[PDB]
């Protein structure tokens, strides 16, 4: 556990994180995929051995001694808003369990279901709030990774509003 568990946000490639483990925005099949998933595949390809896992779950595979937590958010193209929201909250709960089990002091995490799986909607607040619901009871330092300046601003504001 971190001495003073915190949330932070950084606008950079999650494949260049400075934390003790990473959460992949995985697909259910363990495929190299696109976006965050493709970056994670290029950086830690060994972590895709038997990484396939259902929607709403997380499966950890080691790359060397570096844990990759493959978290499978729903594709809102396919899910109803209601069932998609349940599966998205469940994926983050499984991430919290894995972060705790591993005993890490820090984790790098993307906002699940906010890219190709968003079904063309802005899901920053929905996804971030499920992340907080799951991770608030953990003592790891959480570092959220994003790409766009206006996402960075909004995520930073949301963290600060609770502090
Ligand atoms: Cl996504």
Curated annotation (Swiss-Prot):
Domain remark from Swiss-Prot or TrEMBL: In the N-terminus, the macro domain displays a mono-ADP-ribosylhydrolase activity. The central part called, the alphavirus unique domain (AUD) has a zinc-binding function. The C-terminus region, also called hypervariable domain (HVD), is mainly disordered and binds several host proteins. This intrinsically disordered domain contains 2 SH3 domain-binding sites and 2 FGDF motifs necessary and sufficient for the formation of nsP3/G3BP complexes.
Subcellular location: Host cytoplasmic vesicle membrane
Effect of residue 36 to E/F: Almost complete loss of mono-ADP-ribosylhydrolase activity
Protein name stated in the entry: Non-structural protein 3
Outcome of substituting residue 27 to R/Y: Almost complete loss of mono-ADP-ribosylhydrolase activity
Domain of life from the UniProt record: Viruses
Job of this protein: Seems to be essential for minus-strand RNAs and subgenomic 26S mRNAs synthesis. Displays mono-ADP-ribosylhydrolase activity. ADP-ribosylation is a post-translational modification that controls various processes of the host cell and the virus probably needs to revert it for optimal viral replication. Binds proteins of G3BP family and sequesters them into the viral RNA replication complexes thereby inhibiting the formation of host stress granules on viral mRNAs.
Residues the record lists as binding ADP-D-ribose: 13, 27, 35, 115-117
């Amino acid at each position: 556990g971190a001495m003073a568990p915190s949330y932070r946000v950084k606008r950079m490639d999650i494949a260049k994180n400075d934390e003790e483990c990473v959460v992949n925005a995985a697909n259910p099949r363990g495929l190299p995929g696109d976006g965050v998933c493709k970056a994670v595949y290029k950086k830690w390809p060994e972590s895709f051995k038997n990484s396939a896992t259902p929607v709403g779950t997380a499966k950890t595979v080691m790359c060397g001694t570096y844990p990759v937590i493959h978290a499978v958010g729903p594709n809102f193209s396919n899910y109803t808003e209601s069932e998609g929201d349940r599966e998205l909250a469940a994926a983050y709960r499984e991430v919290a369990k894995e972060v705790t089990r591993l005993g890490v002091n820090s984790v790098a995490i993307p906002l699940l279901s906010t890219g190709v799986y968003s079904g063309g909607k802005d899901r920053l607040t929905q996804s971030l709030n499920h992340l907080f619901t799951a991770m608030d009871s953990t003592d790891a330092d959480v570092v959220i990774y994003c790409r766009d300046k206006e996402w960075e601003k909004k995520i930073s504001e949301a963290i600060q509003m609770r502090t």
